[PDB]
Design an enzyme around this catalytic site. Sequence first.
Site, PDB file in Angstrom:
ATOM      1  NE  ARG A  42      60.752  29.098  10.073  1.00  0.00           N
ATOM      2  CZ  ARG A  42      61.828  29.867   9.921  1.00  0.00           C
ATOM      3  NH1 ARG A  42      62.014  30.560   8.804  1.00  0.00           N
ATOM      4  NH2 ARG A  42      62.699  29.979  10.913  1.00  0.00           N
ATOM      5  CG  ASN A  51      57.253  26.184  10.316  1.00  0.00           C
ATOM      6  OD1 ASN A  51      56.791  27.269  10.685  1.00  0.00           O
ATOM      7  ND2 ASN A  51      58.385  25.685  10.799  1.00  0.00           N
ATOM      8  NE  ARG A  74      65.079  30.059  17.472  1.00  0.00           N
ATOM      9  CZ  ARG A  74      64.503  29.390  16.477  1.00  0.00           C
ATOM     10  NH1 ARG A  74      63.864  30.038  15.501  1.00  0.00           N
ATOM     11  NH2 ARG A  74      64.562  28.069  16.466  1.00  0.00           N
ATOM     12  CG  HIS A 130      57.999  31.286  12.634  1.00  0.00           C
ATOM     13  ND1 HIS A 130      58.939  31.801  13.501  1.00  0.00           N
ATOM     14  CD2 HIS A 130      58.371  30.005  12.395  1.00  0.00           C
ATOM     15  CE1 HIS A 130      59.834  30.869  13.779  1.00  0.00           C
ATOM     16  NE2 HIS A 130      59.513  29.771  13.122  1.00  0.00           N
TER      17      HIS A 130
END
Lengths: 326, 328, 326, 328
Positions: free
Chosen positions: B99, B131, B162, B186
């Site tokens: 990312r 991102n 998740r 993230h």
Amino acid sequence: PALVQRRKKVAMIGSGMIGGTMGYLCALRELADVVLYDVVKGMPEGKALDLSHVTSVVDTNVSVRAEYSYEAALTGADCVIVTAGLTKVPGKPDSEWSRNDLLPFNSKIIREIGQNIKKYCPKTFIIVVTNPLDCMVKVMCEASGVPTNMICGMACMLDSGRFRRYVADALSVSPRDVQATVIGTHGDCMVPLVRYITVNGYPIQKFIKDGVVTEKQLEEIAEHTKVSGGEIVRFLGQGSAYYAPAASAVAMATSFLNDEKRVIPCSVYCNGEYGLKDMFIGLPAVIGGAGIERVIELELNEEEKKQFQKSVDDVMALNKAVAALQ
Amino acid sequence: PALVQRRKKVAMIGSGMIGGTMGYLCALRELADVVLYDVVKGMPEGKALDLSHVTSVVDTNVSVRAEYSYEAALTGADCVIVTAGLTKVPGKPDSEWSRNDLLPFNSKIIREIGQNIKKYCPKTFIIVVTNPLDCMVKVMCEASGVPTNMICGMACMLDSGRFRRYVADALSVSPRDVQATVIGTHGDCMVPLVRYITVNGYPIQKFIKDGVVTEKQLEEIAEHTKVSGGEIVRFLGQGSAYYAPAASAVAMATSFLNDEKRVIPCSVYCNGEYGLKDMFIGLPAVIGGAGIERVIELELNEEEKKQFQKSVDDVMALNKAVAALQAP
Amino acid sequence: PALVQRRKKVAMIGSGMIGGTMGYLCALRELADVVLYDVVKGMPEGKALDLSHVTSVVDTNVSVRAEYSYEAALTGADCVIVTAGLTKVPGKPDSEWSRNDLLPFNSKIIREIGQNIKKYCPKTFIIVVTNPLDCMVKVMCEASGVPTNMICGMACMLDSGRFRRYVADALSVSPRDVQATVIGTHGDCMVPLVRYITVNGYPIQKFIKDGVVTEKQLEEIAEHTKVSGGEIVRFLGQGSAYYAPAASAVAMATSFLNDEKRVIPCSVYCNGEYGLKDMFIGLPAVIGGAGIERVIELELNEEEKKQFQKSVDDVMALNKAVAALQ
Amino acid sequence: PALVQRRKKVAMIGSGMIGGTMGYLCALRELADVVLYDVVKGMPEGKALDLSHVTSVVDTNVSVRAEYSYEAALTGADCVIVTAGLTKVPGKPDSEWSRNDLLPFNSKIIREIGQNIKKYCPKTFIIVVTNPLDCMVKVMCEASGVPTNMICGMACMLDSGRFRRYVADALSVSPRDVQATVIGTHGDCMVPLVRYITVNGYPIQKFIKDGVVTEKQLEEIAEHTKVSGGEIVRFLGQGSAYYAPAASAVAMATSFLNDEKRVIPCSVYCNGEYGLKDMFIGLPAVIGGAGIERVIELELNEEEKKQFQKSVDDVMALNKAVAALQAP
Ligand SMILES: CC(=O)c1ccc[n+]([C@@H]2O[C@H](COP(=O)([O-])OP(=O)(O)OC[C@H]3O[C@@H](n4cnc5c(N)ncnc54)[C@H](O)[C@@H]3O)[C@@H](O)[C@H]2O)c1
Ligand SMILES: CC(=O)c1ccc[n+]([C@@H]2O[C@H](COP(=O)([O-])OP(=O)(O)OC[C@H]3O[C@@H](n4cnc5c(N)ncnc54)[C@H](O)[C@@H]3O)[C@@H](O)[C@H]2O)c1
Ligand SMILES: CC(=O)c1ccc[n+]([C@@H]2O[C@H](COP(=O)([O-])OP(=O)(O)OC[C@H]3O[C@@H](n4cnc5c(N)ncnc54)[C@H](O)[C@@H]3O)[C@@H](O)[C@H]2O)c1
Ligand SMILES: CC(=O)c1ccc[n+]([C@@H]2O[C@H](COP(=O)([O-])OP(=O)(O)OC[C@H]3O[C@@H](n4cnc5c(N)ncnc54)[C@H](O)[C@@H]3O)[C@@H](O)[C@H]2O)c1
Ligand SMILES: O=C([O-])C(=O)[O-]
Ligand SMILES: O=C([O-])C(=O)[O-]
Ligand SMILES: O=C([O-])C(=O)[O-]
Ligand SMILES: O=C([O-])C(=O)[O-]
């Protein structure tokens, strides 16, 4: 042609405030066909019509019908929700309202219903609502003969929802993100688990340190939780709570019918948990397609064990009492 | 006569996989009128038509349309969800997907969008998705100029989502009743809080003692959680996850539009929390009708603080690089 | 222990744009466990993971997974929705897009899926989506061997949906209250029934007289309806529509799984309607727990019969072409 | 910080069976904050508590409160749904139940509530439920002073819903796909438009010709529709229907709050339609963000006009008598 997919069927044994309300949720969500049963002639047909009308207004299609015989009501029922019985002792002040005083009145009704469930739908999932709850579940279990994982009583999900709403208000968050549980016997001896309160899994303790809520305030909330039923009884003047009780019961029915496996506290059969056997009491459980699939035996602190033991005594005393009646 | 109750309007700035999918959710739930915006012309119009057809099929009524100008897309939007940008660097093996590598391509785009929001809907609530998320939320904040409580990045709800699905599968319970949270930036330095996992508020440690799950299993689950994004990128072959990302962004938007005050972790402005200032990072927060109404500070332990601290350094280093490299 | 209530299972044979979107709808609504199958490896597992993550985010609990063998994907499927195939002819210009040209490519794929359904889930409800739709359902029928009431094609609900949206916009009302139907073959010969347009059961003619919309406008909407699939193909650049197509097929499957008995136009097996036999074509039908429970044969005026005959000829030629190929 | 997205607020003036049930729908669907107002003390508080509890059980978040002053209940109300009033005349046999008999008991109540709305929330959308419906809508309109498009009465959606259920059962299809409408006044003179019945737009006549239904069967359905209210009154013993009435009212409120523009027959102000002026009567109309946005005039044949003229005469007579007896 040949019916391949059959709608689920839920029989509401007792068509008073709660039975009718649960029927409403079924029609509103198209969860299942509904059977309304009661000893009072006429009323059930009026509600069935009213509910069948709802399906058109909300564009859903389930069948809602009244039935006056146990055989027509129970045959083919995937889940039976029992609310038959009294909510208040006749000629007794609202201030003296006690769920336990209902025992001599509702015991024989629960027993008869269970004998009929045994005869007409022995494979159904039974959800009892009639007070005194934990006691009535046992009576129902003994009379119905269904496996112990196929019967439970709705009580603690309602108490926990009350607990959750008060905490939610104190914290200013959706009650969806407040996990608060009440275990034990549905009554003045119920045990609100203040220590286990989480906000989306975050310990309530931190919220106390950050001053969002005080310890005194949480204790008051636990107290409000214990007396919430009587509070509504007093405000209403007649009957008792029915919106939340109906929503809780249907949530449990749904977790069963859709095999969701929700973690819901309810009155479940004890297989040795806490050293308890051959009885039903409120504990966190998992409801799925096989019925009660798990019963959680939470570690209790001193105060909790104390309260839970009293909860247990209350239940065992009620079951002793019923055994003495018949 | 005069319109008294107007539908909410959510502008999807970027109409690719996620933008179109979020448009779908709005249509399916009659959540709000939808505007699809993209630099690619033609495609958002096709999706707008497709989505408008959905309303008929599911009996709802919201307007779904494409706009090609920033002015027409942003004007009047109660919430703006930004997904504009690249998912993968051209000519790079899926095995090497990262990312952070997108930083050079998406920075400029996010900044331009923020300048347009400042110009056309400075009172909107901004939800960033592009991102590298945490850096982009900051770029967006600086460029748009909106109050800090009126902007956030969507990521940790997806990561927690998740985390929750895996735990729910190990315990055989509905993910509705698994509260598992991921905080931090993230990426590979995200922090799955294994110690905090609860099942309807019951400590995971109870399920460990009961013999239902082991610490080992839980740690493997946290590791899966961390590499879940790349895993999907590798399986898909092209692009990245969009179904759960879209549902996450819309859930946050819905909590805002309906003032639900749900507790959802997301990338939020830090003004002292965990000792962080002038930056955005994934933390548990309350999203209400007043935007980010509260940022929750958890009592992290030594190991947790160490992992979070690594997360903090990654985003701070990147933010400094972005500021250093920014055009005047 | 013993599972009593089992979730419904829907197999998506083909996991491209539409198969994934339908999976999305199943997970979002907790409609059923989902299986994603495809000839492409890796991709279905990627979407299954993404979709399973969705259940957490929207608090539902259904199992979503990829399966590579027909046996694994089809076994236990209460309903199979087939989207396997091509959307465009390789090399052909977008301006020359035609569903009929897909016949040589998709006929073999559909036949094989049909044989595998006969083998692993002969009692399932089949919903075909793969184009050329009406022709492909026929292929699926012959290869699958299932009861004629247990197979149908999704197309007209989508065409009608488009028809309703355009009408809804012209009148400034919710599409919920526009009844517009397209019958015939899903293609350039489809027949939007302008004369049968009603607004909550009220004749469209009155709205014409009230000047809310002109006859010329309705006719342009009918035309837009016909060319909507290609209009989207041209705007997208790659692939074709998938959001409404997916919603349409799941609505059909839902009417089946919950025995809703919705009246949904779809491609069904003809037993003499319009003199049609041994073939499939789009007609209004009632879908319920027993599959196609009724086929409605509307009275057609001269223009409609004329347009419908062209629809019939289109599909009869296609079925003719298929018998020649395999 | 500053609230930007405020929840919608619906005030239930009258917290009996219907008032409480509508609050339930609002809590169940997280449609809006709810205020329960009544003259009976204590009861609204009991119901508000019970409904607040529901929010937790079904994971929604809306505020449900009981208010005892008109000001607290009405201020800030986006929509006001009035059910305040009697359901039956005391001492009268169920076999003699008549909605028009309620006129002298409910007219002043309706007028008072109207006077308070004019003062506390003149911009609200008013939905009257109290019987006799069409006459009360007019009283409410005069007392409240709101624009005529901002007020209507709930009735024909309920009557049409009963009509649809019976037809759906006869045809063995979902009521969702039956379009059956009742126009006129909510009473024995209501007009079930049998000739206009359609099944997803397909005329009922074809089902008759194809032998699915008979002429007599449909006639019994229209008759059953007219008497449905009393039928439930007699079955119940006490009170009248509340489940469908509540859902019908909230469906109308929702079409307004979400600007859905649903086509729902309801009691609407007449400005020429069918030749009627300065009065309200059940007719199909479009409900959206601007309240009643369109009233549909259907072509009626001889028999329909005769029956509709009969309902018109009933309501005009009553409206005349009500005005003659109103207190200064
Ligand atoms: C555990 C819990 O959380 C909770 C909450 C609220 C109420 N309750 C209890 O739930 C029950 C129902 O409450 P409700 O619906 O408000 O009460 P209510 O509205 O009085 O209805 C009970 C209904 O059961 C009917 N009935 C009586 N005897 C029989 C019989 N033998 N067979 C079939 N029906 C019969 C009775 O005629 C009436 O229609 C009461 O016992 C309450 O105390 C429990
Ligand atoms: C934080 C988190 O959890 C998460 C999850 C998944 C994806 N993402 C990121 O979200 C973004 C979008 O994902 P996607 O929808 O799958 O991507 P994709 O399908 O490629 O769509 C991105 C869209 O934005 C468009 N675009 C490019 N430049 C501009 C511009 N200047 N202005 C307007 N539109 C432009 C582009 O044409 C395309 O339609 C990527 O940056 C992803 O990496 C973040
Ligand atoms: C009738 C109607 O209204 C309508 C609307 C939109 C699309 N369609 C058609 O629906 C189909 C699917 O469209 P889409 O999902 O957007 O297309 P797309 O996204 O290309 O996906 C089709 C999927 O099927 C897969 N596939 C190919 N051969 C096989 C095989 N033998 N076994 C299993 N999977 C295979 C392929 O790999 C891909 O994943 C096409 O035939 C379209 O033309 C019909
Ligand atoms: C049009 C239609 O389809 C339809 C259908 C069903 C019932 N209704 C009518 O709707 C009304 C309510 O029915 P319900 O809720 O079942 O009845 P019910 O449960 O008796 O409640 C009416 C409530 O209003 C209260 N009330 C009386 N006077 C006042 C006042 N001045 N201010 C505030 N509250 C007051 C009363 O205390 C009671 O709680 C009746 O007039 C019914 O006839 C109409
Ligand atoms: O049991 C009860 O009556 C209650 O708690 O509402
Ligand atoms: O960021 C991503 O692409 C992800 O996690 O799915
Ligand atoms: O079949 C198609 O591609 C369509 O109509 O969307
Ligand atoms: O108005 C009524 O009471 C009815 O029809 O239900």
